[PDB]
PDB file of C-alpha atoms and ligand atoms in Angstrom:
ATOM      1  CA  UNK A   7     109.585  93.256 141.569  1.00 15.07           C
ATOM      2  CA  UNK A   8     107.567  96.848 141.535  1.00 12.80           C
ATOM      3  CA  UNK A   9     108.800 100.361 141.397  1.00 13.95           C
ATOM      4  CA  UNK A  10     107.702 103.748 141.839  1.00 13.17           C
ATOM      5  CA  UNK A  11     107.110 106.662 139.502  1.00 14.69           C
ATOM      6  CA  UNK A  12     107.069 110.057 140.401  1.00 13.97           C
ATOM      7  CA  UNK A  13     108.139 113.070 138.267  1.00 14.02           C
ATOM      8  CA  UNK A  14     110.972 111.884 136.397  1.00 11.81           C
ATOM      9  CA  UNK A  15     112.159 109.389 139.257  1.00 10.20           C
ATOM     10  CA  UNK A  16     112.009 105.636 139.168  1.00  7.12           C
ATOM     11  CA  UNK A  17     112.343 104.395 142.808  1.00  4.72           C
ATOM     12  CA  UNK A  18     113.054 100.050 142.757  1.00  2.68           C
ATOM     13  CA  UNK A  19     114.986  98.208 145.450  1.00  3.85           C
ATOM     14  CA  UNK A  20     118.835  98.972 144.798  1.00  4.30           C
ATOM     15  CA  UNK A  21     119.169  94.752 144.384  1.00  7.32           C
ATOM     16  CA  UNK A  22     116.604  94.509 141.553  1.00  6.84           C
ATOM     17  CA  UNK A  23     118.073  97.887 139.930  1.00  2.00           C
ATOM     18  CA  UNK A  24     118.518  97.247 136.175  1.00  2.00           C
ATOM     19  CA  UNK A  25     121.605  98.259 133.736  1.00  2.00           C
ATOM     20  CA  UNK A  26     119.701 101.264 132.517  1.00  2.00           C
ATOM     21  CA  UNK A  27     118.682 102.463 136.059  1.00  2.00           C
ATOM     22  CA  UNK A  28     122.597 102.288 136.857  1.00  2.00           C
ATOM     23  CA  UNK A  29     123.088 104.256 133.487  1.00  2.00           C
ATOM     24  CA  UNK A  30     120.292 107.020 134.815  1.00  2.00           C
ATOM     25  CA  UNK A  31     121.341 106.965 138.431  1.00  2.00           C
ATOM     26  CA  UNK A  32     119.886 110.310 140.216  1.00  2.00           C
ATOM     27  CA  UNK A  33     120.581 108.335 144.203  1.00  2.00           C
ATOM     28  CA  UNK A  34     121.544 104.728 145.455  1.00  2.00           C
ATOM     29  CA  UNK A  35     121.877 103.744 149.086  1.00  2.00           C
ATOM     30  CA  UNK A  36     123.014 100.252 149.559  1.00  2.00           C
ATOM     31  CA  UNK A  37     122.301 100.822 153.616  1.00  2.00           C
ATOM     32  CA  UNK A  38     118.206 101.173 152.324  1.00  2.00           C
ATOM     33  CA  UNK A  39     117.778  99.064 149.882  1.00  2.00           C
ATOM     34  CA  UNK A  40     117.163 101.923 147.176  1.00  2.00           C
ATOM     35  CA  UNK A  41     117.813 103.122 143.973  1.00  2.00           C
ATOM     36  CA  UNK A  42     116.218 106.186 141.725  1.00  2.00           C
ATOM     37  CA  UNK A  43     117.043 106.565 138.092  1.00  2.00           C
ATOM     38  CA  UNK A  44     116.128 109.162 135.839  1.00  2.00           C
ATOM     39  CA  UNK A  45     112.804 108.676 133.503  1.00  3.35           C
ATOM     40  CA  UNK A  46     111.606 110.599 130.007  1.00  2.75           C
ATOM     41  CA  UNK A  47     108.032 109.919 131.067  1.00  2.00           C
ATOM     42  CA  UNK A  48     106.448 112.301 133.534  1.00  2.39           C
ATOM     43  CA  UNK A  49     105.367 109.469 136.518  1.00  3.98           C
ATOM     44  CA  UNK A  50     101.972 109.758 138.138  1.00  6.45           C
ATOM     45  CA  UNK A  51     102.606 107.984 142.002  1.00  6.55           C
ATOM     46  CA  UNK A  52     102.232 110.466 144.736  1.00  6.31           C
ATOM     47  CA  UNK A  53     104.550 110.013 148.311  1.00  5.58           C
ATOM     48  CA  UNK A  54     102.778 109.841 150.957  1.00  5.18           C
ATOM     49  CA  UNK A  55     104.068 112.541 153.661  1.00  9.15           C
ATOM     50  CA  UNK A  56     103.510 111.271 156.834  1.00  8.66           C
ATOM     51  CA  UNK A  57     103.978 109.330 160.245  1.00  9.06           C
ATOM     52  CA  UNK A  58     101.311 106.657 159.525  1.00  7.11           C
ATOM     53  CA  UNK A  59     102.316 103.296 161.061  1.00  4.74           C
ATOM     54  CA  UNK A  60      99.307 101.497 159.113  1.00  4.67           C
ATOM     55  CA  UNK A  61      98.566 100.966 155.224  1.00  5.18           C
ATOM     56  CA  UNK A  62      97.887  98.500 152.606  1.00  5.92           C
ATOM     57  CA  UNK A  63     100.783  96.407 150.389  1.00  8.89           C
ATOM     58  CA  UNK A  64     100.883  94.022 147.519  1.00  6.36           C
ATOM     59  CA  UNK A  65     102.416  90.457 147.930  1.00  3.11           C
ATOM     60  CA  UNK A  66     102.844  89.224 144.552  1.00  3.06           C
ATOM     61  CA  UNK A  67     103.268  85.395 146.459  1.00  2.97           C
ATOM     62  CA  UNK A  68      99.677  85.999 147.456  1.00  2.71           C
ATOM     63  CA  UNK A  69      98.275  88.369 144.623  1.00  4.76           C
ATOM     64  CA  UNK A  70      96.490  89.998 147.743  1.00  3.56           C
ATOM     65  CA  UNK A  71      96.916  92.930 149.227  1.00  2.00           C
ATOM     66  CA  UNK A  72      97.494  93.001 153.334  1.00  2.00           C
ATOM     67  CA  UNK A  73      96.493  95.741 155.899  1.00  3.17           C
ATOM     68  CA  UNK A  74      99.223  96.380 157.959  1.00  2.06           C
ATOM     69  CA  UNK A  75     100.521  97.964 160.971  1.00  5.41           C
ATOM     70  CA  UNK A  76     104.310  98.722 160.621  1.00  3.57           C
ATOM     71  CA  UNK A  77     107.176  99.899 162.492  1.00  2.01           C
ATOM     72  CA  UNK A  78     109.093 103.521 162.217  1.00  2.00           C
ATOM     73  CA  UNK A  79     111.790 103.403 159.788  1.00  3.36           C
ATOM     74  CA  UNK A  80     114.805 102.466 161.597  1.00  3.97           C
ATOM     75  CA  UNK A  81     117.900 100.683 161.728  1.00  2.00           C
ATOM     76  CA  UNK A  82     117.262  96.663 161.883  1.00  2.00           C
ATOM     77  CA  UNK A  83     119.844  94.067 161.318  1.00  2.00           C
ATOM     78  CA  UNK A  84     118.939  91.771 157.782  1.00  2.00           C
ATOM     79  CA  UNK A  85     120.077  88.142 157.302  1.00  2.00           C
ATOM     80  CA  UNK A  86     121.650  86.804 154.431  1.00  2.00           C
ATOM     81  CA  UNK A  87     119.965  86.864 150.881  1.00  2.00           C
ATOM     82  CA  UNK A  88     123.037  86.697 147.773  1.00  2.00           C
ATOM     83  CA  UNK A  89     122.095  90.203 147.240  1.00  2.00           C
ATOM     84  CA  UNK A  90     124.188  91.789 150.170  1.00  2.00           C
ATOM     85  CA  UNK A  91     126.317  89.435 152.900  1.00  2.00           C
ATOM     86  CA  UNK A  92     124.667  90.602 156.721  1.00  2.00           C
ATOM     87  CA  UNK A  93     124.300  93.877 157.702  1.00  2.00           C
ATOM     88  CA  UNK A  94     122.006  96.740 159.226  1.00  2.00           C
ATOM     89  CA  UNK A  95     119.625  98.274 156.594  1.00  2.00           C
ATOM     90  CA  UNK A  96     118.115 101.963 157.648  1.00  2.00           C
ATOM     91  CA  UNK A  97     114.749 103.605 157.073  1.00  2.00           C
ATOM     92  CA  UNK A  98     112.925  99.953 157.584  1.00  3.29           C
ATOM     93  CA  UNK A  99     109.457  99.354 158.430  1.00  8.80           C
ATOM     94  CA  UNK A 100     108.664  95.687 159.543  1.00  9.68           C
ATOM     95  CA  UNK A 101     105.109  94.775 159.492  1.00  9.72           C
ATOM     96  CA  UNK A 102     103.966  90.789 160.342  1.00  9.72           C
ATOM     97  CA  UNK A 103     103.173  89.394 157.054  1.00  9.51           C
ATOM     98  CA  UNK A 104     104.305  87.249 153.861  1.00 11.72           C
ATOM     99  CA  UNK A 105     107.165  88.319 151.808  1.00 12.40           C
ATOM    100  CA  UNK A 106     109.457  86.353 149.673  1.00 11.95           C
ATOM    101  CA  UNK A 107     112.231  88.019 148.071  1.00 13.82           C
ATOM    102  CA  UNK A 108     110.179  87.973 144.589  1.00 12.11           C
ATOM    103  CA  UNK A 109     107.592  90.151 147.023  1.00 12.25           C
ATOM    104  CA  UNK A 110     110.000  93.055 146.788  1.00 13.11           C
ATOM    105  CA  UNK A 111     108.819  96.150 145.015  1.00 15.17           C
ATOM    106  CA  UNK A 112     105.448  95.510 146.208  1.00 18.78           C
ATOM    107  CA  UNK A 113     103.919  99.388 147.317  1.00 17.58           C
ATOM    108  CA  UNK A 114     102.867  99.881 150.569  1.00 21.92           C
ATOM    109  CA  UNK A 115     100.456 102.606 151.158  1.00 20.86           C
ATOM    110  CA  UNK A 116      98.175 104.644 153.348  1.00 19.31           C
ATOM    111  CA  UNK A 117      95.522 107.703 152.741  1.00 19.56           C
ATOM    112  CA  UNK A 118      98.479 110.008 151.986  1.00 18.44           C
ATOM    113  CA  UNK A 119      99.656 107.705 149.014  1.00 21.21           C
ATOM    114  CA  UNK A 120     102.995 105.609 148.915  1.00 22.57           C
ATOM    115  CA  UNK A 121     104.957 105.148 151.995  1.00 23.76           C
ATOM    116  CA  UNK A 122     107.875 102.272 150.933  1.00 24.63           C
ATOM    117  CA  UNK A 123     108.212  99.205 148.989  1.00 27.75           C
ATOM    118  CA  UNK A 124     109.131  95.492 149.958  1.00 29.39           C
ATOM    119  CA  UNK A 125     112.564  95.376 150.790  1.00 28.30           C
ATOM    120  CA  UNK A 126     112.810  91.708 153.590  1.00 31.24           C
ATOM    121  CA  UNK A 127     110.878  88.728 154.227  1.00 33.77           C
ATOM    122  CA  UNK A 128     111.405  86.309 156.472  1.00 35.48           C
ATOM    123  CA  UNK A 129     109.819  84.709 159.407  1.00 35.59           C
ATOM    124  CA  UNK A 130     106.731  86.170 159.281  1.00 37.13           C
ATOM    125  CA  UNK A 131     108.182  89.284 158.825  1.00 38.01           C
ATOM    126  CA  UNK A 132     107.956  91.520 155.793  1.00 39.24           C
ATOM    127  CA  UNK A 133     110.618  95.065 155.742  1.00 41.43           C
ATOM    128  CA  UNK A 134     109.250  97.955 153.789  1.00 39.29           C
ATOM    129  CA  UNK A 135     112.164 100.621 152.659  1.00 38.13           C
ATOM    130  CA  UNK A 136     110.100 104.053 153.056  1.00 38.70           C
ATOM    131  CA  UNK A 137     110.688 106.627 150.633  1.00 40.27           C
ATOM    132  CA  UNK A 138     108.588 109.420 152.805  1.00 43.44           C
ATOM    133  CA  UNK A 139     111.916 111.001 154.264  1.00 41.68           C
ATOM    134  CA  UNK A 140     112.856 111.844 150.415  1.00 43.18           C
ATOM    135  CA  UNK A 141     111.200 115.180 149.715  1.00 47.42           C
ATOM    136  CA  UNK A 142     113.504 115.529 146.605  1.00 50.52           C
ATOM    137  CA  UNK A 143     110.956 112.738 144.702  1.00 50.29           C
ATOM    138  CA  UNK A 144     108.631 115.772 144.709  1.00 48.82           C
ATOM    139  CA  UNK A 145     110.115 118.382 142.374  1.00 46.71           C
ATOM    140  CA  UNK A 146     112.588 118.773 139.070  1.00 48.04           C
TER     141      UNK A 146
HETATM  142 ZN1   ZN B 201     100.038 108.445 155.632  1.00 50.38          ZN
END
């Protein structure tokens, strides 16, 4: 698990989303993994903007953090999980490294501050969804 707080935005992988981020929806895609919900509390996380391809992320299965070099966001086919059936999930960054599915919501960042969060695992594989295309996170 892991989110991130920015102005009045909570950002958490759409699958982990809870019954109050439903209730406080501002933007779910189900295509990124994503979900924002509406907060009281004035969050202090700053997006990185940005076309860095390396950064830093937490693995929870590891309690370390990882440098990593990472893919552009694009659009790469995902497995199965319960979660969603088999599909192609968009603005995904894979990096080589260790992530289980309780790994998701683990930050990844670089200088410029948060790029994504864990999104896939998988044979030696770890998916970050970015969030740097969402200039929106950044005001009201
Ligand atoms: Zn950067």
């Amino acid at each position: 698990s892991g989110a991130i707080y920015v102005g009045n935005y909570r950002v958490v992988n759409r699958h982990l989303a809870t019954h109050n981020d439903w209730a406080n929806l501002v933007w779910e895609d189900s295509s990124r993994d994503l979900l924002v919900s509406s907060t009281t509390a004035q969050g202090c996380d700053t997006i990185a903007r940005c076309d860095c391809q390396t950064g830093v992320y937490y693995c929870s299965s590891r309690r370390k953090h990882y440098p990593v070099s990472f893919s552009k966001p694009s659009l790469i086919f995902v497995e199965a999980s319960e979660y969603y059936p088999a599909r192609y999930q968009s603005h995904l960054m894979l990096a080589v490294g260790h992530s289980e599915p309780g790994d998701c919501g683990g930050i990844l960042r670089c200088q410029h501050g948060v790029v994504g969060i864990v999104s896939t695992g998988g044979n030696g594989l770890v998916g970050f969804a970015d969030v740097r295309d969402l200039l929106w996170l950044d005001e009201e």
